[PDB]
């Protein structure tokens, strides 16, 4: 039986921040990933 092998997902993490002088509240971009499996 034919088995397609795919390496399981990867992607860089983009971090959006304002100035640390302004705030420490930050946001995270997961790129090229539909966030159906976020946690790992």
């Amino acid at each position: 039986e034919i088995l397609d092998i795919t390496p399981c997902s990867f992607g860089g993490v983009s971090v959006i921040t304002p100035g640390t002088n302004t705030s420490n509240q930050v946001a995270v971009l997961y790129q090229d990933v539909n966030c159906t499996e976020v946690p790992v």
Binding site: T6, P7, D32
Partner: peptide
């Protein structure tokens, strides 16, 4: 008239450009 794979598996990320095709037409 202007036309390897869509998926690459070793750290080859093509990034989306900031300015989309629609607003360049705008």
């Amino acid at each position: 008239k202007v036309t390897i794979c869509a998926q690459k598996f070793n750290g080859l990320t093509v990034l989306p450009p900031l300015l989309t095709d629609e607003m360049i037409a705008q």
